[PDB]
Amino acid sequence: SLTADQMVSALLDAEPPILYSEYDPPFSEASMMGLLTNLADRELVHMINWAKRVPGFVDLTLHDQVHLLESAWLEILMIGLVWRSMEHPGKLLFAPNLLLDRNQGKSVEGMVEIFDMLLATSSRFRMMNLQGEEFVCLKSIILLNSGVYTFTLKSLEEKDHIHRVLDKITDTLIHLMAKAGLTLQQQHQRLAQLLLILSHIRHMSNKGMEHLYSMKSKNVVPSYDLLLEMLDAH
Amino acid sequence: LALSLTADQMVSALLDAEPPILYSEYDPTRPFSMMGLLTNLADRELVHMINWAKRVPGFVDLTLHDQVHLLESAWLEILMIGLVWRSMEHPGKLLFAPNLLLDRNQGKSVEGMVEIFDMLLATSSRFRMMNLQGEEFVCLKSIILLNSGVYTLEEKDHIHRVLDKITDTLIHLMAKAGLTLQQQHQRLAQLLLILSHIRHMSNKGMEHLYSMKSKNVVPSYDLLLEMLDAH
Ligand SMILES: CC1=C(c2ccc(O)cc2)[C@H](c2ccc(OCCN3CC[C@@H](C)C3)cc2)Oc2cc(O)ccc21
Ligand SMILES: CC1=C(c2ccc(O)cc2)[C@H](c2ccc(OCCN3CC[C@@H](C)C3)cc2)Oc2cc(O)ccc21
C-alpha cells in the first residue's frame, strides 16, 4: 500500500551502519581472512535487522524469511561492499580502516579472482553513476528474489506476495528515474541495466561460496537455526 | 549498421535466426547412459548455437576474440534457457529432445542431477505462468549472450548499445501486446530477474558437471573459434 516515495524512504531509513575493523597502532597478509570473517559475521547481524524493515518481508512466514536470507546473504554482503567501494577506484572498502587492493587479495589462494569480479562491479556502478536510492532498491530486490525460485498453499500465497512487493520496487525504481529527468526510453534502458547487474552479483555469490567452502573452515553459511534465532525474536 | 534496425526488424531478425530442435542419438528399438545421451545432445546443440549467435544483430561487429569470450561465458545459460523454453508446454518434464522427455524421477538416476532438474522445471513453470511469448524468449536469449561475459571501452560500449536496443525491443513487444506503461516495466523487470536465476542454474550446473570428472566441460577457445568459421 506504500507509494514509491514511501518505499524509498522506508528503505533508506532501514540502511545498516558501516562497521569498522579492529584498531591497534601493522596489517598482515596472514591475518586478512580472519579480519574479513569477523566483519562479515558482524554485518550479518545488522543484515537481519535490515531485512525485517524491508516492506513486506515480515509478512512472510519465519520459515520463508530464513530461506530468503539463506539464499541471499552473500549477495547482500557483496552488493553492500561494492556500494561502499564505488568511490575508491581499484580498492575494496571492507571497512573504512580496511581498504584492500588486488595485490593484497593474492595472499589468499583463489581470492584475487573474486576480488576482480567485485572490483569490476564497483567500476560498473561508477560508470552508471548509481544513486543511493537505486542501490537500496536493488538490495531489497536481491533479498526477495534470490530464493523465490527454490522454495504450499501457504507457499503459493507467499510467492504471490513476494511478486507484488517486487513489482512495487520496480515502480519505485521507475519513479526515481522519472524524477531524475530521464525519458521513458532512458528509464526502461536503465531499469534493464540495473537488473542485469543482479545476474553478475548472483554469479559472484556462487563463485564466492565455492571459494569459502574450499578454505576448509568450521562453517561457511549461516545455519537455518542461526538465521531463525536472529530472525525469530521474542 | 546493425543498430539502425527498428524494433520490428530486430524481432523478425531474431525469430529467423532461431536454431533447430535436434533429436537424441539412440536406437528407439533398443533398451533404454543418460549423461551420455545428454552430453551428445549438448555438444550438437552448441554448434547450432554458434550459428545463431552470428545472426544476433551486433554480435559479429565484435572482434572474434570477444565473440568467443561471450560464448565461453554464456553457452550453458543459453542451453538451459532453450531447454526450459521447449519444456514449457510439458509440466513436470524436461524436453531435452522430442524423443527424450525426462521427468525428475529419471533425473535421480544420476547423482547430483535431480537438484538441477528441479531448478529447470521451476523455471519452465515460471515461464508457463508468465505466458512467455516466443518474441520475448528470443530477446532474453540474446541478452544472455551479450550480458553474461561483459564483466571480463569501444567493445563494451557497443555491447551496451545492443543490449539497450533489445530492451527497447522488449518494451515495444509489450506495448504492442496492449500492456500499460506500468505493466510494461513490471514485466520487463520480471523477465530480467529470471535471468539471474538462469545464471544461478548455470553456476550450479557447472559445479555439477565438473564434479562428474568427465573428459572436459567447457568448449575450448579453439573449438568455439573454429565453429565461428572466420572469414
Ligand atoms: C565479499 C566479502 C568476502 C568474501 C566473499 C567470498 C569470497 O570467496 C572471499 C571473500 C569476505 C568474507 C569472509 C568470510 C565470509 O563468511 C564467513 C562465514 N560466516 C558467514 C556467516 C557466518 C555464519 C559464518 C563471508 C565473506 O569478507 C567480506 C566481509 C564483509 O563485511 C562483506 C563482504 C565480504
Ligand atoms: C541443461 C542440460 C544439461 C545439464 C546441465 C548441467 C547439469 O548439472 C546437468 C545436466 C545436459 C548437459 C550434459 C553435458 C553438458 O556439457 C558436456 C560438455 N560439453 C559441452 C560443450 C562441449 C565442448 C563439452 C552440458 C549439458 O544436457 C543438456 C542437453 C541440451 O541439449 C541442453 C541442455 C542440457
Author numbering:
A (entry chain A): 309 to 333, 336 to 461, 465 to 547
B (entry chain B): 306 to 337, 341 to 460, 469 to 547
Reproduce the article's own wording on this structure:
Ligand binding mediates distinct changes in receptor conformation in the ligand binding domain (LBD), leading to differential recruitment of coregulatory molecules, binding to specific response elements, and post-translational modifications, such as receptor degradation. Agonist binding to the ERα LBD stabilizes helix 12 (H12) docking between H3 and H11 to expose the activating function 2 (AF-2) cleft for coregulator binding to a conserved LXXLL motif. Antagonists bind in the hormone-binding pocket and extend their side-chains outwards, preventing the agonist conformation of H12, which docks in the AF-2 cleft with its LXXML motif and blocks coactivator binding, promotes corepressor binding complexes, and affects downstream transcription. Overall, each structure depicts a canonical antagonist binding mode where H12 binds in the AF-2 cleft to block coregulator recruitment.
The ERα LBD-OP-1074 co-crystal complex was solved to 1.55 Å resolution by molecular replacement with one dimer in ASU. In the ERα-OP-1074 structure, the methyl points towards H12, while it points away from H12 and towards H3 for ERα-OP-1154. While all three analogs displayed similar binding motifs within the hormone binding pocket, only the 3R-methylpyrrolidine of OP-1074 is directed towards H12. This conformation prevents stable H12 docking in the AF-2 cleft and destabilizes the receptor. In agreement with the trypsin challenge assays, B-factor analysis of the x-ray crystal structures shows that OP-1074 increases the relative disorder of H12 compared to the other analogs. Although H12 is docked in the AF-2 cleft in the OP-1074 crystal structure, it is likely that the helix is more mobile at physiological temperature, as evidenced by its increased turnover in breast cancer cells and decreased half-life in the trypsin challenge assay. In comparison, the t1/2 of OP-1074 was 3.5 min; thereby exhibiting increased conformational dynamics of H12 relative to SERM compounds 4-OHT, OP-1154, and OP-1156, but decreased dynamics compared to fulvestrant. It should be noted that B-factors were only compared between the “A” monomers/chains of each structure due to significant crystal contacts in the B-chain H12. Together, these structures indicate that the PA-SERD properties of OP-1074 stem from its stereospecific 3R-methylpyrrolidine that disrupts H12 to increase the conformational mobility of the helix. In the present study, a structure activity relationship emerged indicating that the orientation of the 3R- methylpyrrolidine of OP-1074 is sufficient to confer properties of being both a pure antagonist and a SERD (PA-SERD). Moreover, when compared to the ERα LBD-endoxifen structure (a SERM), the methylpyrrolidine moiety of OP-1074 adopts a vector that places it closer to H12 than endoxifen’s methylamine to disrupt H12.
